[model samples]
Target: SSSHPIFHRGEFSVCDSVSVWVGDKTTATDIKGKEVMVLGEVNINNSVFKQYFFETKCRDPNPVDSGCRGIDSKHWNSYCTTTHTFVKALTMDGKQAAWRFIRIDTACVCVLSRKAVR
Candidate 1:
């Protein structure tokens, strides 16, 4: 089973990006060189999908507070969600910005696409 305490499972990241900011560090910098899960090419839009996984120390729920962190999934999920709003500005903007989004054992989807593609 997944020790991640899995909450929502859908489109999380694209090309293993590092946009979410946690404390003085970011997900990309703090957790560098983590293994990425290649979800293969997206058939719907032909875009590739990727995710990161690693074990390291980080802030707890309240990153501002001095508590503890988890290598489990929820910890990372929380961190990602913190900065997700910014992405919403672009993803859920006037038009769809992302291509097809999918994952393993996933049912729900947040498909945001633009009118035209380049």
Candidate 2:
């Protein structure tokens, strides 16, 4: 159905990569080696564990936050969201930037790519 089509269906990473951080392993990195240009800042707010995830969007609502500033998705939807739990990396090309994961408390997509390769 058009309502259900996973954007990143099994190709999450370019290939398996080394976990550069502590407490990580083969299945340590969530996004694996998915080369994504992360957005703003990802804080480690876990006492014993951390909360990381990928924010996906089937349709963009077109708000002021399209540029990584403004409202979050939590104000819209909260359940059944297909979010990840780790992608704390950043990427940049010229003036364009993308985020790997921006798992906010709300369910929404903050950063977007300038290319049509997605």
Over 4 Å off in model 1, which ranges? 1-40, 44-58, 61-81, 85-118
lDDT of 1 by residue, 1-118 (tens): 7644344664343212223322211122112233222222222456533332222332233432322233333333323222221110111112534322211111221122223323
TM values, all candidates: 0.14, 0.16
Displacement of residue 25 (Cα, Å) in model 2 is 13
lDDT of 2 by residue, 49-88 (tens): 3233323343333333232233233443212223345544
Q: Report how far residue 105 has shifted in candidate 2, in Å.
A: 21
lDDT of each prediction vs. the true structure? Answer: 0.25, 0.33
Colliding pairs, model 1: 4-73, 96-113, 96-114
Error of 1 at 41 (Å): 2.4
